[PDB]
Symmetry: T
Amino acid sequence: KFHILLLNGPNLNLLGTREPEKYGYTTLAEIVSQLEIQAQGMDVALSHLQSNAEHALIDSIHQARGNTDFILINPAAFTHTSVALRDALLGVQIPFIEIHLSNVHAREPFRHHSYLSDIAVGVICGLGADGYNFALQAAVNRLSKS
Amino acid sequence: DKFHILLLNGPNLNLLGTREPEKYGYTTLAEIVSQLEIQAQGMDVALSHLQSNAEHALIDSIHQARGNTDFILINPAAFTHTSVALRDALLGVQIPFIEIHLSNVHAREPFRHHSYLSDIAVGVICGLGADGYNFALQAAVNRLSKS
Amino acid sequence: DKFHILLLNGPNLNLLGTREPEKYGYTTLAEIVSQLEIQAQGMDVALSHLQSNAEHALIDSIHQARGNTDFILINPAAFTHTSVALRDALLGVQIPFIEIHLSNVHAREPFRHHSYLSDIAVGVICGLGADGYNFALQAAVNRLSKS
Amino acid sequence: KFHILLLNGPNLNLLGTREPEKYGYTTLAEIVSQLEIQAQGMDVALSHLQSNAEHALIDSIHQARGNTDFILINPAAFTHTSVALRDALLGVQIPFIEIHLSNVHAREPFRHHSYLSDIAVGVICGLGADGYNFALQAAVNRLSKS
Amino acid sequence: KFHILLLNGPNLNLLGTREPEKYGYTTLAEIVSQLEIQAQGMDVALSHLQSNAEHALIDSIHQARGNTDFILINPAAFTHTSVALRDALLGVQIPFIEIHLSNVHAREPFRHHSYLSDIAVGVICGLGADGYNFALQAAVNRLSK
Amino acid sequence: MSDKFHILLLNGPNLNLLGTREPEKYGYTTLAEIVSQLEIQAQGMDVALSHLQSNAEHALIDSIHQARGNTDFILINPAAFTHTSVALRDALLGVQIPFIEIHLSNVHAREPFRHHSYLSDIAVGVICGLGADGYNFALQAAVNRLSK
Amino acid sequence: DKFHILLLNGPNLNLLGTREPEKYGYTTLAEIVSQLEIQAQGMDVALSHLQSNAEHALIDSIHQARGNTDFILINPAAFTHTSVALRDALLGVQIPFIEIHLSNVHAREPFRHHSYLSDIAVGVICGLGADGYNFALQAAVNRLSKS
Amino acid sequence: MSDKFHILLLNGPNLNLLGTREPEKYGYTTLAEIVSQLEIQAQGMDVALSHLQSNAEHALIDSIHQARGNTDFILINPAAFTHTSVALRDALLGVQIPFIEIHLSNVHAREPFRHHSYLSDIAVGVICGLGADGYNFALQAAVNRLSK
Amino acid sequence: KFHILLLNGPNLNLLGTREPEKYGYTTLAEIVSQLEIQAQGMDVALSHLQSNAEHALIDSIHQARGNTDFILINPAAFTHTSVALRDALLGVQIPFIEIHLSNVHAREPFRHHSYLSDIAVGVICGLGADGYNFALQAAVNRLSK
Amino acid sequence: KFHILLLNGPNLNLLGTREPEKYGYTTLAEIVSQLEIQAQGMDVALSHLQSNAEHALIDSIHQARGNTDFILINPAAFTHTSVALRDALLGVQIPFIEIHLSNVHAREPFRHHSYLSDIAVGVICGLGADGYNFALQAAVNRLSKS
Amino acid sequence: KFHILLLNGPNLNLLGTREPEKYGYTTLAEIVSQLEIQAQGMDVALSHLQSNAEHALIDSIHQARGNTDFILINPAAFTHTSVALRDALLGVQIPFIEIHLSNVHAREPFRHHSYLSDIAVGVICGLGADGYNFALQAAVNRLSK
Amino acid sequence: MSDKFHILLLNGPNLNLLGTREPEKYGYTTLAEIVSQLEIQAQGMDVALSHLQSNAEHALIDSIHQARGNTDFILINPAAFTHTSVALRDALLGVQIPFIEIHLSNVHAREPFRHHSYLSDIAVGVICGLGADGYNFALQAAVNRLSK
């Protein structure tokens, strides 16, 4: 069975709380529950962690070594700032896909910079929660080739 | 009225599957497009396609989409880094689009980080190979099916 | 021998008057051009026109102007930011030109501040809408009428 | 009747004095007299001020508030340097057109920078004194729509 | 009754411990205690947290949602580095004022960059502890309108 | 030479316009009202306060020069000149009277060019974005520092 | 099997010999090409040529060279500074090339220092006028004659 | 307060992974082995050595704060934090304990972003690219300087 | 008889008033008076203006047209900021030498930028008051050829 | 008879010594001997100097004044660093062609910068030793026009 | 028997001559002599050259080809400027360690740039003369494996 | 050790060419003529003057080193080396002899790369664009400063 770790970075716990009539009502719990149902349908063992702590995400990545086939990560703000997270992913050598709900290129210029996009298998941005669904499909498709 | 989606492919994508296939892969552009057509039929969506090495042909296609096209899926290839004219065609016609790249364009030269399209796209998918077209189509139909 | 002026319009300008007219305005490119033709006739000047989304077509037009054209009026649209080839066509044929933009291109994205044409133009008019073409034509004829 | 203020910035009083056989014989007084005749023909009330003093231009702009429909300004060197002039124009909220006699993009790279061009209705450069004539036509055309 | 949250970032626990004959004797606990007294006089409930941990500041901000009217924050070094902190503040939509004890424009050029100043109501720097007093007054003045 | 502190308030270009631009959406408070309020506050603190607003860079420089030997602290809202005037910076450095820089609006929430300043690095401190209250706080800060 | 070399000339090079010949020189593009053809015949090499102002035409020519062309000689003119699509055509077909400029493009505007081709070229010759084409051809044939 | 020097060794994020990534091509030496070797060296020099490795920026900052009044020198391999942590820089500046910065690999032979550091300019010195031996040399350097 | 105009920019009126035991006692009036005497010995008529106002310097330059052979200018802070001053000098086409008392390359990096140095005949910096003496000699030497 | 000076800069004496099975076996002595034979065939008087010393190259250039018609120079690393060499060439006003064996644009970004390319008649890079042959042909062709 | 070449760049001959009560008394000859003794204890033959001439350093490197196992170099100012020195080292393919006595990141920003650090085995800075001792130990440790 | 001042004049690369390039349009004055004139001026001021011109960076560095303990001031026209030689900067800093930088031409009126210098920030002052007279003035400046 394939084992996939879903990581959500800082502030994603707030999803669906800020002016939802403007920004959307979907919550992180709903996205995760949706992806668990999908993974179960594909015979994937999915694990999840959301954290506002950089160290907790790094620890999860370290703990994945030897037992996890792929990482799906929405790094949120840490994609722009965390060399430590980059080095955690590089150190464990588990492939990953980077996911952003919104289009991060349509915002401040500082959000164009990433310490993860260049080492990711790929990146999905701007497609909302569907991005997680697609990333999971892509991971399973890849793992199924070899 | 079923949705109509226009798939645009930019320069050099006609070469897919021809450079060192045992190394880079065998999938051709015609295979990708024909698969996407059958996926679209399954979603009860009409799909038109154009691949061109000519910036003007892509621009003309975008202009011609006015009033008959609900969404654009575009793999702009090298034109994403260079074509303000394509950006302005897309803005001019006001049809939403998703930008697709087969490879991870952030893992190559620094100049490929710059785009005249990524900021005005609904979203972007890179590095997932041909599947990125399937996901972009699903994304488009999901978005259209809400509104 | 009356003066002959070539009016060139670049990419996407064929869309004028079609995007949200109550917001952006109703004037079309054909209306602007037909008005400029009648203005030119009044000044006893011959006026030729080409609009194209193809860089090569604009370049070919500039080449073809050699020996028959006294001045060029060009709204290069997005190509002003990207086309060194157009710059080099203009320098190659040595026909003076004025650069025209309908909108104030300094009030939009920072990338639109860069031009490969503005430094070699006689002058530049931006932000005055269609009137900018009328003023550019008057400017050209005034300059030709001195020399 | 429409009321239009023409402002000329520093050094424009020297027009027609420097190597005129090379640079031109037209003087500022001639341009202004030409524009006054034109404005009178259009039924526009035209006022003028040329100054080498930034504060005098700002004061003129402040004094225009409530009585002036449009500003035509050749800011000369101040277009590259004066945030105060920008803020005067923004503060009084009178639309303006920026005029330069010469093509300022054909000179030093520092002359490409402007604190006015982005907030102007439009800009005319490189057409010599005719630029003022066209700017006045444009202003009247605009004012005549609404 | 207004509720205001005072957040202090990394290293501010060291205030008054480094060469005080040179840098001053005022400690963080003194500043906070003095501010609490000022708040009581203004009918404001003042909560406080100092932390060297980015996540603890983010968590405090999240926990302020629905019960806090204004945030006063001295982000210290995180103002230059934390997009996550910026996004916490944007996400909860509680207005805030940024406070620095020293003039952070008089130091290294890297200190000129901030991920918070552009989204703050305002910024006060270089005025020492009084900056907190002024920020608190500003906050109450704004909430009272 | 008295024992009473004397503070000079300087206001730069365009600040005379305060309260005239879209009053309903920006406020009706005028510069005259801000200064008169600050004069009352200063009286209450038993401190002398002088004021000058000018659109002329040289007038502000001359005021700074004329403050030598009679002014304990300068409060300055330089407005647009903070981004452009090396001459004002050098006037303040030349006179060695401490100052606080004040902006009504948050200048970091505007164009990127407004992030640059020739004064903020040599000021005792900076207050921005707090409206007229920033003048009140800067005066309190000045008096508090002088009273040490 | 003799070697086959494709000579590509980019935009505005059709104007060679026409701008102020007493100042800039009289040699035309057709003269250069016809001389290079006779040089190629002497080296027992087949030489094909295309000059175009259209980026797409150059790209199509490069694509069409696959499987029949041993080396490409290209004077890209202004496209060297702007065309990522041409870079990607060359990389896509994996035919080695030499970049040729008639004039010293480092002695003009700073923007002409940037190239999307010079880093992937076997080499570059600039500033030697028409002779640069002769040298590039000799270089190509020498390289092919070793391997 | 003793006469014996006390040195604090700090190891930043991901250094716990040492010896786990492609061992045949990168080596089998673990962080535990490096620290135990350094403890033996320190014993031999009659110096006390404390160690902490953490993936948490705050844990390293807290360790630095807790070193006040008991630590003569800090040896730090900050790993990725050297490029990003102004907070660590300010912890070290706040405590005023001298330190040496250590990197196992040559960080200048990697991505250009790794050339930037918030620590290298305030360190006594920097050692990079010499593998585990860099820790040995940094400890020798520290003791040599303290012994002056 | 050559006529030379000496222009002094903003804040130079303060020369000799700030910590003179440290920065020196030489005042602007002393420098100008000494230079006047030197000029008299060289058969030069020397005119002078110091101003904190950009427009006053520009006006002086304009007024020099047709009656002034050379300009010696210590532009002070305006060298870094005034395109208008550059254009006044270009417009009147009177050659000039730029003088700074201190070494303006030994200070903030912003002081390295100038709108005048590239169009000056030459520049003298860091030599104190002597720089004016040398500039005057240079000017006369050039006019005498 | 035309007189041409060939200058080779630092490290070019190592040619053919570093991993020749990978980088090539051609030595500097062979290139120079090849060019001497070529020059003799063209009736050109060729002089050569290779040096690792910037001053020696500058001195050679100074000594060429009045007796040398053209300079062929492979400046090696000095093209990126030596303003003095640029000023030597400018000072003596002898035209030159710049030659690099390898394609210097395919290496580190710092190698794109040159203090010589902009004042050279032309530049040849990436064609190996043939580059010297072509440069000599170009020089003779030029000299033969006038 | 390993052979190691120690190269010292420009101005290092001045070590110990400028304000020694402030900057220290250790001279280059003392450092080299001490290192020679250390080398003898490690069965290493140590050769040395200090030069203010770029070409002399380049020549020494070229002459090391085939007889030298490792290079220890304190390039001084040339680390920031000499592409030629970089290419000499690359050309001869002898591994090297870069040594600086002072912390060159604590000085002007221009000193952060190097044409050697990225191709060195490693770099040691700011540790004074000990840096040479450590570099020598590192070199021997690496050659002994 | 005498009471007479000793000044060292250094001329950098290519300055030996003075007077040879297009004489009719650039002038016929040679370096030899400039130096001989400066020697006469120095004699007149009762000051000793030594001179060296070299195209070799190391020769200039060695001259600077050899000036230690015998030279009161250095006058240097570094020519192209001002833009490139950190080594010369460090020689001058190492010897702590004050210097003035001299350029015959206005180097700010040329290519932008000539605006950068490794010497101008550590020089007492700089004179450019005044031709040979710049050497005369720099010598006067040096003697005037030493005479204080």
